[PDB]
Every structure is written in structure tokens, then in C-alpha cells.
Amino acid sequence: AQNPNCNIMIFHPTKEEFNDFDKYIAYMESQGAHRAGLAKIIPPKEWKARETYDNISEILIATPLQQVASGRAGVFTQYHKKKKAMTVGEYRHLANSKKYQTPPHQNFEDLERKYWKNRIYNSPIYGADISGSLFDENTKQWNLGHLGTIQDLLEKECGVVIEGVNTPYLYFGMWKTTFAWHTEDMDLYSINYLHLGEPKTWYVVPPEHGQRLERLARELFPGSSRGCGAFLRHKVALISPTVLKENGIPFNRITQEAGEFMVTFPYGYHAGFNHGFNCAEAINFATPRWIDYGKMASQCSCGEARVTFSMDAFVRILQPERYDLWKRGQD
Ligand SMILES: O=C(O)CNC(=O)C(=O)O
Ligand SMILES: [Mg+2]
Ligand code: NI
Numbered sequence: 001a002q003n004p005n006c007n008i009m010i011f012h013p014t015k016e017e018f019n020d021f022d023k024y025i026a027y028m029e030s031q032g033a034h035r036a037g038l039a040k041i042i043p044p045k046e047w048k049a050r051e052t053y054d055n056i057s058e059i060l061i062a063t064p065l066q067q068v069a070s071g072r073a074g075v076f077t078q079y080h081k082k083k084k085a086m087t088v089g090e091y092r093h094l095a096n097s098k099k100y101q102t103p104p105h106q107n108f109e110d111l112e113r114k115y116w117k118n119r120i121y122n123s124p125i126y127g128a129d130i131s132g133s134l135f136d137e138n139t140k141q142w143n144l145g146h147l148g149t150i151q152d153l154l155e156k157e158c159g160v161v162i163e164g165v166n167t168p169y170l171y172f173g174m175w176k177t178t179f180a181w182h183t184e185d186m187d188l189y190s191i192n193y194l195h196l197g198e199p200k201t202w203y204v205v206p207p208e209h210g211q212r213l214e215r216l217a218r219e220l221f222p223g224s225s226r227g228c229g230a231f232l233r234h235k236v237a238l239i240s241p242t243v244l245k246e247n248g249i250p251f252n253r254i255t256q257e258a259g260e261f262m263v264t265f266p267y268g269y270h271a272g273f274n275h276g277f278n279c280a281e282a283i284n285f286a287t288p289r290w291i292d293y294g295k296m297a298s299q300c301s302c303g304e305a306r307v308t309f310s311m312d313a314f315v316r317i318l319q320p321e322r323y324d325l326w327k328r329g330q331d
């Protein structure tokens, strides 16, 4: 068995190997990459996403989200308070202000220490989940707006034609902006490209050990657990590495820098934070190996998780017993 300790693997494809996206994902899995739940892909030196980032300031962040924490430093939830619209140039200036900027630090480890010590005492503003793309239309390799669609994968594997579409999302971050512990919708893959700015630190639990994280979360967030049998689908709970280590939960960590891709694998729980002003692009995708994960994915039916139009068909075809209850949650 390849990668039996479930370490995060880092790949350096050549420009020739960067042509065929599906083939390279399958190669990474042949080497055991999926066992970690997360892999890093450094693009060949010849490749670029676009020519420059000099002209992005007029993108609108229609609903910036202020991430307000409750709890203790290592075990907290966050809620998202909606703020007035602002442009990416306005948001960058805000991120760089004395109230929100990255503090002085020695290295990524010192910054990570400061994040876990102090996150709860601040409320950073995240421009998340913005439909759109920063890849140039002429970028032919690993262009997250030109991937094969999940609807087409389902149709190719299972024969059933379904409605829905699959487009990327932009994320504009600042110091301390936070992504809570989660797997993807329908335990899909994700791919995330850090277009510009400061790093993103990731934490991940191997898919084979995901239920250990879930049992800890039920113990740490006991009211939330009574409310919903899949409350991590709400994407609000944080647990620090120190707390994970104290409770014996297997995990790994890695920091993504500008110009690098990350792939999350089916049922790989992940969480993390931004180091300072940045912009990332991410999208879900599927392979043949995902179908069995999609059939087994948990679902929130309490009403909190509320998701895209396209998840309807995935539930209806892969999980017809759950369909009725899940759709009640959506309506
Ligand atoms: O970058 C973020 O805020 C969150 N991204 C992801 O969870 C992802 O790419 O799967
Ligand atoms: Mg612009
Ligand atoms: Ni994710």
C-alpha cells in the first residue's frame, strides 16, 4: 500500500505531465496521495495562470463576511456577519490597515502560534464564495474554469444525464480569515489555486480516519451535535492542532504559497487560515473513484447547510432514500 502513514505529498509535474489533468490526478493516487486527504502540486516553471494581477481591483465583493468567534482559543465556532459591499481594492486596503494586518513574526511557525493563541479575540473580514475566475482563457493547463464537469463525470460513469452546472469561486482573504473543519459537498474533491498574496495554512485528517474527527467534534460541540447528525456541514467549527493531538486524532499540516495548487480528496476533512491579504480560486471536481464516496456522504437535513442547485441531482441519483428528507431541509 502506497503512503501508509498518510503523509501530505508534494508533486512537481513537468510541462508534459501538466497537459492531462485527469491522468495526473490518477497518477498522484497511484502513489498514495489521497491517503493524506490533501496534496500540493507545484506547476512547471513554464506555466502561468495569467499575465499579471495588476487589473483586479475593481472586482466586487458584494457580501464580505465578518467572522465572529465564540468559545475558547482551541475550540470555537464562528458566525458570519454580512457587511456592506466593497471592491477588491477597498478590501486590500482594509486588510493592510493597522486593525487587520499581519503582525510581525519570525517565520510560519511563529505566525501559526500567534493564530491559535489570538484568533478568537479578533473578527477578520473574508470575501468568500464569489462566482468567477482569474485564469486567462488562453491558459490551457489546469485552468479551473475549463475542467470536465461533475455532471458529465456522473453521466460517463453511471449513464444518467442530469441538470446542473459546476463553476469556480474566488476567495479574498486577510490575516486570521478562517475556513472551518469540513469535507466537500457530497464528499467531492476540491482544487484550490493561490493566485496571489500571502500564504494559506491547511490542516487535514486522512479520509480513513474521518470518523475519529467526527466523534471528537460531537464531544466538543455537544448542543450542535444534538441539533444535527451532520453539523460539520455547517462549516462553523474549529479545533486546534494542540486539541487534536491531545485527543489522538491523526492529522497533518502544510502551508500553501502563491502559485501553488492544493487538491483535497473525497472525505478529507480540512480547515485552515490565511496569513494576510490573498486571493484563491477553487472548484469541486469528481473522478470515477469519487462515486462510492458520493453514495455514502452524510447529509445535513436540519436546514442550516443550504447549498447549490446542482447538489439536488447528486442526492436524487446517488442517495434516493435520503432525497425526500434532505430536500425538506433545503425548503
Ligand atoms: O480557501 C478557503 O477559504 C477554503 N477552501 C477550501 O475549503 C477548498 O479549496 O476546498
Ligand atoms: Mg478589476
Ligand atoms: Ni474545502
Ligand SMILES: [Zn+2]
Binding pocket: 227, 228, 229, 230, 231, 233, 234, 300, 301, 302, 303, 304, 305
Ligand atoms: Zn444541519
